[PDB]
Amino acid sequence: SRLYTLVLVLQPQRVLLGMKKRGFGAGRWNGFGGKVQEGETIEDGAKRELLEESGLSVDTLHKVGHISFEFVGSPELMDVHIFSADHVHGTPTESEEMRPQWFQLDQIPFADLWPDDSYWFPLLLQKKKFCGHFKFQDQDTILSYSLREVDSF
Numbered sequence: 001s002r003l004y005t006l007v008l009v010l011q012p013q014r015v016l017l018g019m020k021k022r023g024f025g026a027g028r029w030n031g032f033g034g035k036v037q038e039g040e041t042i043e044d045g046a047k048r049e050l051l052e053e054s055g056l057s058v059d060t061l062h063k064v065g066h067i068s069f070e071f072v073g074s075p076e077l078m079d080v081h082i083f084s085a086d087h088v089h090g091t092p093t094e095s096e097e098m099r100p101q102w103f104q105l106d107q108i109p110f111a112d113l114w115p116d117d118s119y120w121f122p123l124l125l126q127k128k129k130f131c132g133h134f135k136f137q138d139q140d141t142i143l144s145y146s147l148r149e150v151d152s153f
């Protein structure tokens with residue numbers, strides 16, 4: 001298993017997603033994040049990746065979710081810690097990896113996000129902390145999942 005982060009930049013009626021321009025999940029919208037490095041906590045990793053990919057800074061993040069990901073015929077698990085950045089400083093800025101864009105919450109193009117996102121985004125937007133596991137047949141196809149709400153992490 002490998003540690004990753006995912007940070008959703010949320011304002012009362014809109015979210016700043018990023019169009020992944022290269023790498024894993026290229027061509028889909030997503031939150032900002034990446035691998036957690038040796039020598040940083042998960043949260044600091046989430047903050048560093050948000051700053052790097054969007055030019056945005058935060059005082060704090062909310063822990064909102066935790067989801068493990070599995071691909072059929074690959075033993076390597078992605079242990080993804082999901083944060084909400086409720087309040088950001090600075091100006092959204094395109095990076096080599098991400099082009100930030102704002103979407104009003106009822107207009108998020110779920111068709112162009114990872115397919116799991118349409119399952120847990122509703123929990124996110126209702127402020128319900130969640131735990132889950134998703135097993136993908138391929139990058140477009142969920143084979144199996146479980147998802148539940150938790151009171152804390």
Ligand SMILES: Nc1nc2c([nH]c(=O)n2[C@H]2C[C@H](O)[C@@H](COP(=O)(O)OP(=O)(O)OP(=O)(O)O)O2)c(=O)[nH]1
Nearest residue numbers: 004005006023024030032033034035078114116117
């Ligand atoms: N919304 C969503 N995010 C996912 C899914 N699967 C998945 O790995 N992620 C997130 C976790 C990370 O933010 C990102 C994968 O990390 P990455 O490898 O692209 O990050 P990165 O290149 O920036 O890593 P770094 O080397 O920059 O640290 O995608 C998914 O199914 N849905």
Ligand SMILES: [Cu+2]
Nearest residue numbers: 062085086087
């Ligand atoms: Cu907050």
Ligand SMILES: [Cu+2]
Nearest residue numbers: 059087088089
């Ligand atoms: Cu402030």
